[PDB]
């Protein structure tokens, strides 16, 4: 129920559902390349609801989930594959919703796509979106894929497209139809949108989620719209803060940003500490970290740092600004409104 600060995460380990959830925190950080002043909160299980400013459109964004997964068979001789019953549930729950809905909606599932034949557990973060139009009773699915490929040189010949499946599209489209077995709705043409080394897929997905929402509010890129600011945001979030799930829930339902508490800085430091002990000498950075954690706890206590503790901190300034540790300290200091550690700690100090 707590997404801890994964220092040293750096956007290539790849995403996982927890991280992605944690990234959802950015949707209402005004100072964020992912900010959404296009949606309001609305007053459907497993999804957060969003009203459109500037529109009639309704937007449901599902909480990411370790079970939102489809497994396809690369061999075409094989059964096309499977979907978790949970994803199938959500699909059905979506159609059940839409049958009663009067205002048009767009549904957003981050899910994972993977080959089951191959022993290699190649799990691919990928995005499903189902829009529903009640006047048409139309339900159009799209899958947004971040490994665009399609290279002329490494294109699958049609015949071999017969021999080999590159994606779950078969099984997925099957699952959607099953949800609609009533033949109560028209399913629009299932398209797959592709674009855009491999480990980047998930962060792309998250960006797309933003886009899909913004577009939805408004309607309707040569390269690198995954802006570095975007990446700085994602990295700093996954890497440096300590979020509870309750916090994120509350954030997305009350439409509030989630300011960085001091405890977040403290935890971040401690985790940095553990990880660093595993790998300026090591004992040096560990002494710095220790000392600093102590000071911040004493602040937390509301106690005044001793002048002595401060002078202690002053050489550790050099040791705590260095590189990685430095960037952690820098993130949090940005988010506490302090120019330096010396600045932050200078008040509430008891002088001899
Ligand atoms: Ba199933």
Swiss-Prot record:
**Alphabetic keyword roster:** Host cytoplasmic vesicle, Host membrane, Hydrolase, Membrane, Protease, Secreted, Thiol protease, Virulence
A GO BP term here is: protein delipidation
**Region of interest (Alpha-3 helix), ranges:** 159-165
Region annotation (Membrane targeting region) maps to: 259-352
- What reaction(s) does this enzyme catalyze? [protein]-C-terminal L-amino acid-glycyl-phosphatidylethanolamide + H2O = a 1,2-diacyl-sn-glycero-3-phosphoethanolamine-N-glycine + [protein]-C-terminal <stereo>L-</stereo>amino acid; [protein]-C-terminal L-amino acid-glycyl-phosphatidylserine + H2O = 1,2-diacyl-sn-glycero-3-phospho-L-serine-N-glycine + [protein]-C-terminal <stereo>L-</stereo>amino acid
Q: Active site: which residues?
A: 124, 145, 201
What result follows from mutating residue 145 to A? Abolished ability to cleave lipid-conjugated ATG8 family proteins
Q: Does the keyword Transcription apply?
A: no
A single Gene Ontology CC annotation of this entry is:
host cell cytoplasmic vesicle membrane
Q: What's one GO MF term for it?
A: phosphatidylinositol-3-phosphate binding
The enzyme's E.C. designation: 3.4.22.-
Q: What is the effect of changing residue 160 to D?
A: Reduced ability to cleave lipid-conjugated ATG8 family proteins
Q: What is known of its domains?
A: The LIR motifs (LC3-interacting regions) are required for the interaction with ATG8 family proteins. The LIR motifs 1 and 2 at the N-terminus bind one ATG8 protein and the LIR motif 3 at the C-terminus binds another ATG8 protein. Among ATG8 proteins, the LIR motif 3 has preference for host GABARAP (GABARAP GABARAPL1, GABARAPL2) compared to LC3 (MAP1LC3A, MAP1LC3B, MAP1LC3C).
Which named protein is this? Cysteine protease RavZ
User: Source taxonomy lineage?
Assistant: Bacteria, Pseudomonadati, Pseudomonadota, Gammaproteobacteria, Legionellales
List the range of the whole protein covered here.
Answer: 49 to 429 of 502
């Amino acid at each position: 129920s707590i997404y801890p600060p994964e220092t040293s995460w750096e956007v290539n380990k790849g995403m996982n559902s927890s991280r992605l959830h944690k990234l959802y925190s950015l949707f209402f950080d005004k100072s964020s390349a992912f900010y959404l002043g296009d949606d309001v909160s609305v007053l459907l299980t497993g999804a957060y609801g969003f009203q459109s400013k500037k529109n009639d459109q309704q937007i449901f964004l599902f909480r990411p989930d370790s079970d939102y997964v489809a497994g396809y068979h690369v061999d075409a001789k094989s059964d096309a594959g499977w979907v978790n019953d949970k994803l199938d549930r959500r699909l059905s729950e979506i159609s059940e919703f839409c049958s009663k809905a009067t205002q048009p909606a767009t549904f957003i599932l981050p899910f994972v796509e993977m080959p089951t034949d191959i022993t290699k557990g190649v799990q691919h973060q990928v995005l499903l979106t189902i829009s529903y139009d009640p006047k048409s009773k139309q339900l159009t699915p799209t899958v947004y894929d971040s490994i665009g490929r399609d290279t002329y040189s490494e294109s699958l010949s049609s015949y071999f497209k017969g021999k080999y499946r590159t994606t779950c599209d078969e099984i997925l489209t099957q699952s959607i139809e099953k949800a609609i077995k009533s033949t109560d709705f028209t399913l629009g043409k299932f398209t797959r949108a592709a674009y855009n080394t491999e480990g980047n897929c998930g962060s792309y997905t998250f960006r797309t989620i933003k886009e899909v929402i913004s577009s939805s509010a408004q309607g309707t890129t040569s390269n690198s719209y995954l802006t570095s600011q975007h990446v700085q945001d994602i990295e700093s979030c996954i890497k440096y803060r300590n979020l509870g799930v309750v916090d994120i829930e509350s954030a997305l339902t009350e439409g509030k940003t989630l300011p960085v508490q001091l405890s977040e800085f403290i935890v971040a430091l401690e985790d940095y500490g553990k990880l660093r002990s595993q790998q300026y000498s090591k004992t040096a950075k560990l002494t710095a970290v220790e000392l600093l954690i102590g000071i911040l706890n004493d602040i937390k206590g509301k106690n005044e740092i001793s002048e002595s503790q401060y002078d202690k901190l002053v050489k550790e300034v050099d040791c705590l600004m260095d590189s990685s540790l430095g960037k952690l300290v820098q993130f949090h200091l940005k988010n506490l409104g302090a120019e330096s550690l010396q600045k932050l700690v200078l008040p509430c100090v008891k002088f001899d």
